């Protein structure tokens, strides 16, 4: 018993550190993916504004 | 449905209000417990002159207002400013009219008789709610974890408490209050982090130390050989990126902050700490009920969310309790809303209807009626 | 004992499902962050090319 | 007056008053603020078709290649003119680390430029890169420089004063004859 | 005599160094805490190429050098440039060889453990002094006023502090630091004096605004009806004659400058002011020691020299303190050197010999030894 319960607080500790890092990295991926459609969208507009001004 | 839908649950805290409808799983509204008063005359573009600000608009605009906290250490200290936070809760946050909704409110552990009568006076006489009810906070936390006997370590923004409850009755003479909580804890991190060689200079630096505390702080078990570990310098370190690039690193202090809850001496507090206090509450109770309390240490409150809090407490009280005893530290995941959820359950319940204090009871018995 | 050991195969099972999803989401965040310095970099250049052509 | 000297120093003479006045029209028409003012002097030396000749009130075609940008580099380097003060970009920044912390992301994404002297082309690009590289990388920099900027101030007044809501802030002779100059002073 | 004569006392500040021999009544050496680095290659007539300049030669020649301040807000921020100021102090200012003199140094209130170990590393390992000792500044100021318990409001050139001390031990958790001092104060006068319709245009105009602040500035009690007085225009005005004839007049602003120390709002500071901070330090201390601290507010530092500072503080804290209390604001005349004098006394003392950290202690215990 001491061994199954000790193996435990360690496996549950690891499970919670990994769930915490996946939540953080998924929040970071959604924010960088959202910074994106924004960077790329104002891009289609800045390049179009260039082709018209160059003309 | 009349009131099945209609019951409101408002949990008034020292830092946050949690609010919503009995029935829901979590608070519809969560916001700071502040009331800002503008230091100068003037306006925002498109708005009129505002006499007052509450919740997040008071926090966001804090540079031109004098901020005030109505609830000091869980007790309502200013009733003019509290009626302001309630008004905001009903009318703006939940957008309901209060005069057709039963309202379950919460109070603190040894809340003065006179206060429970005063918020009843204000609920019925200035908000005109149909019926209301005041539950004690630890008692709703316990109940939300299914049980009726246990001891709650409750810890939020301005207070920590231990409230031993037996078949529902919170035990007045065994309750302990420790005035050191998450607020105290953010300010201590602040200093051990400036002391790490940093500067939280502008207000956008100040606020985020609190978001560092919430995201990266830990309660290590064997806090002893965790400092020792810090020194060998493992990949224990943790860098957070600020509002801008300014990547700040926090390795070690990460757990030196919640070690404050076991050692108040870290902050010039001479009081005993969380685990000893759990215990002392317990050797202040009847003898025959002490096995029950020990197997039912329910945790609730924002500051009890630090990971590994439960393991440290587990081992903290096993090693103070007689070995013949079973220790059991329950810490649920939703614990930052236990109190609220316990109220949602209770107030949406089928049997609670007969404990609601109605305007009939009040207009006929005076504030005494709900006071119990 | 039966309860600590049973609680276990379940906590270890959860730990491995969460470590698998974090690995996948971190691979996806690095790829979308790398599509990025690229979208934004050609952007600093397209907008600069515009301000020079407009001038 | 600094262009004046680097142009007489190019081997010239702005002798009569019809020579003096037009150095200012040279500054306005031909001056530039180069980004990487470093390897722009270097460029000057290889002598590209960077040069620019202006025809004076008469024929006297004067050439200005290089000095063309040495004049607005004075706004970033006051040391060009015996000034010990800091320059435009550092000063933008210092203003900003003198403000509340929570408002500094706002100020950084909203550097609005106005005034006749901020019209030198490439002023905005130099400022863009001047403060990006002083600001914490977590920050968004944004230097707005509109085309009508030599009249921003005026146009902002035209808008505001023709506005529908401004009527109630006008100080009237009623306010004045009754409150003294204090009234409008706020 | 061996070391009775021989003990050195060096007080390192943000603006000035104060230095001399334990035994003397006042510092033998006082000079700016700058290190100038020449912006161009060249020489003065008759001298060689100099890599660096320190103290007054750096101030006097400031137009061709880049000036740098090693101590930011009382803490040593650049150790290359500090070892330069120490070198200058021993060898040029006091003209002593350090390897035969015990050296008492001072540090700031919550000086990082690691710094006290680093200046010990540099004292013993690059200057080879026989023995040394680091005293905390407020603690030497108190002691120089005879006592051992009191609270020091210490205010110099870059920092202000409140350090409550009880039977000699400075109380870590009750210490307050306010980063607004005499430096900030000269620059504010500057603006209210240009704002009076003036120009401190050349560097000979800049420097003397500071000599105006020192000579003519006041801290009025009832700063309220002192502005009111200004208006009736009494013979309150005061004209100073500049390096040349240019008689500048300062009537009123004369006290608007030290009113900045009670109202930080005069300078866009949101922090609390000197008197409130004295008080807050005090309601952060143990209860039983608060009558002691109140009857022993010792003032030290160049910026606490403004006449009538003590009367304003006297009345500022009487009116915040419970009336059952005795208030007592001690402000001695030599206060711009309290710190130093407290060190001179202590280090020349008969009983201090047994606390000197010797090279024997160091070579055997590492920097840890003096760190305490």
Order of helices and strands of chain A: H
Largest sheet of chain B: 6 strands, mixed
**Oligomer type:** part of a larger assembly
Distance from N terminus to C terminus of chain A (CA atoms, Å) equals 80 Å
Q: How much of the sequence of chain B is in beta strands?
A: 15-25%
Number of helices, counting only DSSP H or I runs of 4 residues or more of chain B: 15
> Mind telling me the C-alpha Rg of chain B?
22 Å
State the end-to-end distance of chain B.
Answer: 27 Å
Structural class of chain A: mainly alpha
Judged by helices, strands and strand pairing, the structural class of chain B is alpha+beta
The chain pair with the largest interface is: A-C, 31 and 31 residues
User: Strand content of the residues of chain A, in percent?
Assistant: under 5%
Give an account of the 3D structure.
This is part of a larger assembly, with 2 copies of chain A (55 residues) and 3 copies of chain B. With 55 residues, chain A is mostly helical. Chain A has one helix at residues 2-54. Chain B has 372 residues and is α+β, with helices and mostly antiparallel strands. Chain B has helices spanning 56-60, 79-93, 113-127, 137-144, 182-194, 203-216, 224-232, 253-256, 259-262, 274-282, 290-294, 309-318, 338-348, 359-365, 368-371, and strands spanning 8-12, 16-21, 29-32, 35-38, 53-54, 65-68, 71-72, 75-76, 103-107, 131-136, 150-155, 160-166, 169-170, 176-178, 238-241, 247-250, 297-300, 329-330, 357-358. In chain B, α4 (137-144) packs across α13 (338-348) and α5 (182-194) crosses α6. Chain B is globular. Chains in contact: A-B, A-C, B-D, B-E, C-D. At the B-E interface, loops of B face loops of E.
What brief labels describe this structure?
part of a larger assembly, 5 chains, A: 55 residues, mainly alpha, 1 helix, B: 372 residues, alpha+beta, six-stranded mixed beta sheet, cytoskeleton (chains B, E)
